[PDB]
Amino acid sequence: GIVEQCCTSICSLYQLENYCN
Amino acid sequence: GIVEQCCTSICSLYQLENYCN
Amino acid sequence: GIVEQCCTSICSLYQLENYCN
Amino acid sequence: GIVEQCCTSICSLYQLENYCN
Amino acid sequence: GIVEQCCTSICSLYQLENYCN
Amino acid sequence: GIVEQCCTSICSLYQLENYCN
Amino acid sequence: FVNQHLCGSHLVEALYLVCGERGFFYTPKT
Amino acid sequence: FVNQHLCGSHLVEALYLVCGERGFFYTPKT
Amino acid sequence: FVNQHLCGSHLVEALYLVCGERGFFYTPKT
Amino acid sequence: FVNQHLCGSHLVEALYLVCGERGFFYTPKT
Amino acid sequence: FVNQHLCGSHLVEALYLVCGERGFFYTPKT
Amino acid sequence: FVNQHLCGSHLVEALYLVCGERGFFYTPKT
Ligand SMILES: [Cl-]
Ligand SMILES: [Cl-]
Ligand SMILES: [Zn+2]
Ligand SMILES: [Zn+2]
Numbered sequence: 001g002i003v004e005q006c007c008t009s010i011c012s013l014y015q016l017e018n019y020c021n
Numbered sequence: 022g023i024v025e026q027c028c029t030s031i032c033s034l035y036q037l038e039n040y041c042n
Numbered sequence: 043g044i045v046e047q048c049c050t051s052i053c054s055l056y057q058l059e060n061y062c063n
Numbered sequence: 064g065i066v067e068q069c070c071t072s073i074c075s076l077y078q079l080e081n082y083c084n
Numbered sequence: 085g086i087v088e089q090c091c092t093s094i095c096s097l098y099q100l101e102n103y104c105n
Numbered sequence: 106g107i108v109e110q111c112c113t114s115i116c117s118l119y120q121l122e123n124y125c126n
Numbered sequence: 127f128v129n130q131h132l133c134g135s136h137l138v139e140a141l142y143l144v145c146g147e148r149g150f151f152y153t154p155k156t
Numbered sequence: 157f158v159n160q161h162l163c164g165s166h167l168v169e170a171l172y173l174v175c176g177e178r179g180f181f182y183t184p185k186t
Numbered sequence: 187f188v189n190q191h192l193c194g195s196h197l198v199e200a201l202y203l204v205c206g207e208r209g210f211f212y213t214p215k216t
Numbered sequence: 217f218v219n220q221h222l223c224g225s226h227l228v229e230a231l232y233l234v235c236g237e238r239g240f241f242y243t244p245k246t
Numbered sequence: 247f248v249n250q251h252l253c254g255s256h257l258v259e260a261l262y263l264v265c266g267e268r269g270f271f272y273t274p275k276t
Numbered sequence: 277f278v279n280q281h282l283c284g285s286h287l288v289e290a291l292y293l294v295c296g297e298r299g300f301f302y303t304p305k306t
Pocket of ligand 3: 166226286
């Protein structure tokens, strides 16, 4: 998931934004 | 909510567990 | 400057990019 | 010690509490 | 104590060394 | 540079101070 | 443990500490 | 913006900054 | 995204997030 | 509460949250 | 260096920075 | 003071503490 992706690879702020309420 | 309980007022670590999934 | 724009007032992530090199 | 244990393995909040004054 | 010296008032990094072991 | 040195090896506060404005 | 004021990023850092792998929601609107 | 390498509590900090008053949900695997 | 108050260490953490590898300057005197 | 994997300054953050106004001592090996 | 206000978690992060391996005590009651 | 092992955002925190109101520039390689 995002938690793993950001840590093992990289992720963008745009991907993070998907987790906002 | 959490902001009122823990920032505006004061909360314990136990109360913070209220917001766990 | 940045302190006035983002701390004293309020700024977006886009405005913060103003201070990137 | 606790500093090493928390980092090389895992530790609990209950173990941490032992380091309070 | 440290809170009065460094939070309430203002302290240097050198003064913070006062609280090292 | 300093960013890499602090992370791959070690660095001192005195070296960091060189990056102040 | 104790009771303190936990605000902003400090509040979510505390939620992370407390909840960890369970996950959590931070919903300030409430 | 740039791509991010974020582990542990740094991910939660990033979510906090990105989401602001909307808040967010933190849901790790397992 | 959002607009919030970002002060002190939180401001530079946000600059780090936003700028990353580009680098940034934090110049509070202005 | 969940078990913690805490290195560096993250350990100090955790001690801070856990101990509150009691404060704490940070004593690494060597 | 400088003199600033350092409070709460920021104060203990600064102690960690300054003291490191020596260790430190944070004793707000005093 | 002690020597520092600082990666990522922890370097920016350290620069912030060290430089205070002078501010600083963060300039990673590449
Ligand atoms: Cl604050
Ligand atoms: Cl880390
Ligand atoms: Zn970290
Ligand atoms: Zn803060």
